[PDB]
Each structure stands twice: as C-alpha cells, then as structure tokens.
Amino acid sequence: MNIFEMLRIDEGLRLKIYKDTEGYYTIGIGHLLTKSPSLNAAKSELDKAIGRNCNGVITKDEAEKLFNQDVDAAVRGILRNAKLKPVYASLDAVRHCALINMVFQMGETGVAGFTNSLRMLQQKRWDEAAVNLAKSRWYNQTPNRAKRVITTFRTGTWDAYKNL
Ligand SMILES: [Cl-]
Ligand SMILES: [Cl-]
C-alpha cells in the first residue's frame, strides 16, 4: 500500500464536477476546485487547471495527472512548513502517509493547527496522540476517514486500509 492507493480509497474518483462533504466543487480524486458557490466559477477553475475547455468533465488520465500534482504539492508543502517538517521528519514511512493524508484533506494551514497532536506524534506517544486527534471537528464531520488515518498513526501499519 502507498500514499496514492491510500488517498484513492479515501477520496474515490469522479470524472464530473461534484460537491465534496463540505459542499465545495471538486473533481477527480479529491481535487478541490473552488469554495465559491458558483458552478461557473468551478467550471472556469477546471478549464484553467486542465488547460482545455472541459465543460465540467475530465478523463481518468487527466484525473490521475491532477492527483499526482496534488500529492507532490502536499509533500513539498509539508517539507517547507516550519511546523510540519520536524514532525514528518521524525516519523517512519507508514506514518508519513497519515500526515500527508491530513494535509491533502485539510491543507497545511489546518494541519499546522493540531499543535498538541503534533507534539505527541513527535514524541511518539501514539495512543495519546490518537485520543487528541479525535477531539476535533475533523473527526466529528468525517469519522470513518478520520478513524482510518488515526489508526494508521496509532499502529504504524496499513490495517485500517486492508480489505477496502
Ligand atoms: Cl471535540
Ligand atoms: Cl468519513
């Protein structure tokens, strides 16, 4: 299992513009287009992202290209972020994925806000971190996904994703 398979399970794949769990226009594999309520603004953002007149729909290959760009951006963002870098650097390869997953979903700014959880992860206090991570809007709004990511942080294994 790897970061791509992980996020593919968490985000799914849709080739037409759709609304994510927060009601925002999105496409492909969790690629947020805009927080704006206008489907037209969304269509504009899509065409600009893809480089062609899509009219609201893309191909699987286009979807995978956006996905690759997004994962790369997330990793690079983490690596330049003063608060995230140290944490990421202290973790093993499996747990790196759980952190990238959160950043992919909430943005680095949002993740950088889990200060207490972040210190616990740095200290490798797994069970404590898991409890703290659960005390969040994130857990309450998307509990099944949050549980998968949290279990990953807690165990350092892919068990939460095996069988999906
Ligand atoms: Cl809470
Ligand atoms: Cl969920």
UniProtKB/Swiss-Prot annotation:
Changing residue 26 to E: Complete loss of activity at neutral pH; covalently bound substrate. Induction: Expressed late in the viral replication. This is Endolysin. Its main location: host cell. GO terms for molecular function: lysozyme activity. The keyword Ubl conjugation does not apply. Changing residue 30 to F: Almost complete loss of enzymatic activity. The enzyme is destabilized by 1.5 kcal/mol. It comes from Enterobacteria phage T4. Endolysin with lysozyme activity that degrades host peptidoglycans and participates with the holin and spanin proteins in the sequential events which lead to the programmed host cell lysis releasing the mature viral particles. Once the holin has permeabilized the host cell membrane, the endolysin can reach the periplasm and break down the peptidoglycan layer. Disulfide bonds: none annotated. Signal peptide: none annotated. Changing residue 117 to V: 50-fold decrease in enzymatic activity. Pfam families: Phage_lysozyme. Its EC number is 3.2.1.17. Changing residue 117 to I: 500-fold decrease in enzymatic activity. Substrate binds at residues 32, 104, 117, 132. Changing residue 132 to I: 5-fold decrease in enzymatic activity. Keywords: Antimicrobial, Bacteriolytic enzyme, Cytolysis, Glycosidase, Host cell lysis by virus, Host cytoplasm, Hydrolase, Viral release from host cell. Changing residue 11 to Q: Complete loss of activity. Gene3D superfamilies: 1.10.530.40.
